[PDB]
Write a protein that binds this ligand. Structure first.
Ligand SMILES: O=c1[nH]cnc2c([C@@H]3O[C@H](CO)[C@@H](O)[C@H]3O)n[nH]c12
Ligand SMILES: O=c1[nH]cnc2c([C@@H]3O[C@H](CO)[C@@H](O)[C@H]3O)n[nH]c12
Ligand SMILES: O=c1[nH]cnc2c([C@@H]3O[C@H](CO)[C@@H](O)[C@H]3O)n[nH]c12
Ligand SMILES: O=c1[nH]cnc2c([C@@H]3O[C@H](CO)[C@@H](O)[C@H]3O)n[nH]c12
Ligand SMILES: O=c1[nH]cnc2c([C@@H]3O[C@H](CO)[C@@H](O)[C@H]3O)n[nH]c12
Ligand SMILES: O=c1[nH]cnc2c([C@@H]3O[C@H](CO)[C@@H](O)[C@H]3O)n[nH]c12
Lengths: 233, 237, 237, 237, 233, 237
């Protein structure tokens, strides 16, 4: 139905989970979803639709960077009727107190991208997530025994930045984690009138064992899934 | 004491309520506080300290604009050991569904000011409030039967803006209300490692040019203050 | 009346003196004005009208920062028929030769604010004062035996600036003093077709961190006010 | 091995063909290369290494957008000894005379991204391709009897731009096609001292709305592939 | 002594008048100066040094645009010991009340150039002239019976601007005249610690007889020359 | 006739050689052209029209800086039917390996000017030359046994830049030479739909400080002249 998504209206649920890695999308569907069916494959950007505790939910990769996720997110909302978007991924930590395996919830998202400036007449647009979604995620985490940190994330355009000094600035301002999509997703949601949220796991420290990482990653997914159920009520 | 605050460490509580109008600060201290005492009068920016249900609380005006509030908030944090700041004021609505007397909670705050760019290497700094403070405010409101709206606020530098088209963009992006301090307070809090939040009551409709009434104002004003105060107690738990 | 000024057309003279501190406005009206009367108290921003040597003059505080002063200046011009605005305040010195208690006249005003960019299509708008007003001020000072310095001022948005290197640049470019309103007032005057000027007294040295004394302040303050008042008379000729 | 590439030094040839679609790389490898082998699959970003007319060559997808392609190109240059990068993608046409399926050579690349400004002290960095590479491609097209336009491309960050008027500006300036990565690739090449070039096939008209299908873009653009391949051989001689 | 000025220290007076047209520089020297000697010719940018009422003064063209005048001005101050610079030229009017042949004095200068931003950390630098020089010029004019307008000038980078809307903005903000060098000259003076001033004659209206124009032009020059004498005392 | 050119339609050839120095144009005309005639003298900006190997060609100075050359190039294109513009100037080298007297071909041009941003909605406009013209020049140099580097140039607004660190950035990005007009010329050509190209002779080293003399730059750079002239003939064939 779209140049980037070879699917039809109704193929996706009203809620969609989005990891950056398409392979991760498949992983999620196979692990947590029941009766998951492949719903998209153009450009290898795998998309699936299944059920979670009797609840219809979709999962689809978003690619790396603001421009990539911006395409997918907009299309989903606009052409597939998606109402809520939850980005599940990884991030780099700058804060000394922020440890590996920590779960971070992006209430807001700083960025070095020019996308929001283009949309906001060159002014300062505060890219924020949906309040309810944030609280639902916090509660869900709490129920699982996880203590998620809520704050600002930094969506970078350059993974390999020439400005190392920027990290000091981020630290000074309390940035929780460093990723590359949050701000873009928040911008699209506000622009198209949808609800978004971004959850990440500290994959590394800008300043563990395999089995350990994976456990936390799964925990993050569960938090996301559970938060959706909470929101339904 | 500081260049703008004629007080000493300990004169202020760990949390302070800040209205824009100094006159409102006196009203609050007299109406909701117990055993209140004046702690500042420099430049007529009245400040008081008292208790609310046994809890120590401070109240002081911040003036109009980011630059003004930035001065007070900074001093409070650095020289008075203030941990939480709650701004209570009015705002203009742009959203059709946003009605007068409505209560708005600024989870975030957009702005046309250059303050955050100066701080953030010219990048986009998302001026946000403390999550817990937001949650607490929402709960307190609910407990009082009030339906507060949580979203983005727009902190303007120019009350009398030469660019009216900006209002359309604001509406477009779902901004809840327009005021002139939020973004500055959030920037200061982040810079100094403090917690802040701004609650506003819809004073008028930027669109359908329709102002509220003194009566409605007074009442809604009281509610907002109740919400803020109660929210503090919740945060203490 | 206006949202910020509880007065009616005619309550204010064609020219108004504006200090930042409302308390200073009262002092001026009581000390230099004759048959003065209060015309505003909203938000504690005291305003008065009286005469000086038979000449009708008004005095009112403007608060701190560009956004604050922008509101008052705009209202005065548009709703009160004010033709000339004279800001009288303090400033910080960056220039080694610029000594404390020194009188500075802002012919122009640099700034880190975004207000003029919003007005000027993002280009460089030179915020300047009225030439005649500058000349008059210089003459009045001379007549009083005071040696006023005429140059550029720097209107800052952040009193507590995170970028200290900016001071070196200021020094480099010969800026006379740093305050927080000039650029905003000049922008408003140009936008509404009014005349403005800002006179400041060196309160402290940004560099050799050295503040003035209450005594020296009071005296120098009086001189500045004398200069401003006398300058008005000259302009009337 | 790198964080985004599960390969080792030697797996990649000195020159790499890069389409945005990993599926297109697979197609290229299986249809144009000889004895091609999969050298990368991380994130599904297929990468292959085969032979073309005796010449060792690689093919790998770069994803959509400047931030995506920036990562891959950098790693290739720094950890795989890649010296030349040839992007082979699609683009939207703005010019009336620019018909579909047309082949455009990006000698230069405009952009709305902030990446180059970050590297260039906020100045204007002209993102250009390697001259030799451009010429090689021009001659190759000539030899294949294929018409190819050489000019400026526009690397957009927003496929779904809110600024429609921008298209009129692009048209006025003669931009040949609108894509999403050229400028980023050119910036990386200059930063890491490598040679790059971008070739595109008009896959749609922003004006008319004559977009092609996915399957199309995925396996239909052979012409541009030939040019790229042939251009490499020329560079060798 | 310099790549743009083939002269030696002492060849120029401490004060120099600068028109945009080199041919105009020659014209000034021949008309108002006594014993004027050619002091520079590289690039055809004529420079002369003579006397005016027994006062040593120089005259040299500056070229069109901020970048051109910036070179000349800096060199003069830095390598020739010049202390005061007076630009004498023409400008376009935007204000309805601003008539042709009117004499405008640039107390300040707005601009669309990025030069001052580069110098001022991207902030707003108010490019202004020297106060004394302004007053001296005002007085001089008054003595000649001319009523000069004192205000803001607009130094444009693009003579042939693609932004016609800018003219409305200028008008709204009270811009007196439109030229292309003032801001640049003011920037250099502040940077190198010198004194500058710009005087112009409304050559045209963005909204007369030859003999008329010329008379006013001469008047402007006289004002400039006289203002210098005033400053000497 | 135009406001800056005292000539008439027909006085100029379809292609024009433009040096910054009017004196250099005179030199070119008298040393390389046949039966050359002065077609312009306004402002001393000498312009001539002669013949080269039977080919009608013009030569005219453009002055120093983007704003200067912008005026001349525009008028030429719009009122004199000029189709091709070849700038022949000097430049300062930043690269260590870039020796003096070297000939550089500006395929692209970076800049610190705000002109292109004004035309390009504040985005990044890649100022590039005409491909054919570049190739023609490359072949011409080859035929004359002259070595010529093709790459990016940097069009500066400030010859005497306050930002010395900018040179390190230029060096890192491989800029071939620093001049003051290429980017402006390229912008005009695109705006008015004309073809342009800039060739330069290294007249000094920003690093070493090996600058040449005025007389030099004025009549010594023959090599670049030949290339330009010869390149025109190629374009004809
Ligand atoms: O330390 C980090 N920095 C930047 N991005 C990331 C990411 C995420 O992983 C991808 C980069 O490999 C991006 O999609 C980004 O969102 N994880 N960890 C980091
Ligand atoms: O419609 C509005 N626009 C902008 N600011 C405000 C405000 C608030 O009131 C003051 C100005 O009236 C500012 O301090 C601001 O916080 N109320 N209503 C509005
Ligand atoms: O050193 C200084 N810096 C910035 N502003 C000021 C000011 C003035 O005083 C107030 C803040 O103290 C502002 O209103 C400003 O106008 N005085 N001294 C300084
Ligand atoms: O009309 C268009 N506009 C913008 N980008 C593209 C693209 C290219 O294809 C992908 C988006 O579909 C991006 O990688 C981009 O480079 N194709 N067609 C268009
Ligand atoms: O109407 C006008 N617009 C822009 N510049 C000028 C000028 C001056 O003349 C030259 C443009 O021809 C520039 O050097 C500029 O300073 N005169 N009249 C005008
Ligand atoms: O080292 C240099 N830097 C900057 N511009 C130039 C120039 C050129 O020569 C003139 C300045 O001398 C300008 O027209 C400019 O293009 N030559 N050498 C240099």
């Amino acid at each position: 139905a779209t140049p980037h998504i070879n699917a039809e209206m109704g193929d996706f649920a009203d809620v969609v989970l989005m990891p950056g890695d398409p392979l991760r999308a498949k992983y999620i569907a196979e692990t947590f979803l029941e009766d998951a069916r492949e719903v998209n494959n153009v450009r290898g950007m795998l998309g699936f639709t299944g059920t979670y505790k009797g609840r219809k939910i979709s999962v689809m990769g978003h690619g790396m960077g603001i421009p990539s996720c911006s395409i997918y997110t907009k299309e989903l909302i606009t052409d597939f009727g998606v109402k809520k978007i939850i980005r599940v991924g990884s991030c780099g930590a700058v804060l000394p107190h922020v440890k590996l395996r920590d779960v971070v919830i992006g209430m807001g998202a700083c960025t070095d991208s020019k996308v929001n400036r283009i949309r906001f007449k060159d002014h300062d647009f505060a890219a924020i997530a949906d309040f309810d979604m944030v609280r639902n995620a916090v509660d869900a985490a709490k129920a699982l025994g996880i203590d998620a940190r809520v704050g600002n994330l930094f969506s970078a355009d350059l993974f390999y930045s020439p400005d190392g000094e920027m990290f000091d600035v981020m630290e000074k301002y309390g940035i929780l984690g460093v990723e590359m999509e949050a701000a873009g997703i928040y911008g699209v949601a506000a622009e198209f009138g949808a609800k978004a949220l971004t959850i990440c796991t500290v994959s590394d420290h800008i300043r563990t064992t395999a089995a350990e990482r994976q456990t936390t990653f799964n925990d993050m997914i569960k938090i996301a899934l559970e938060s959706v159920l909470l929101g339904d009520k």
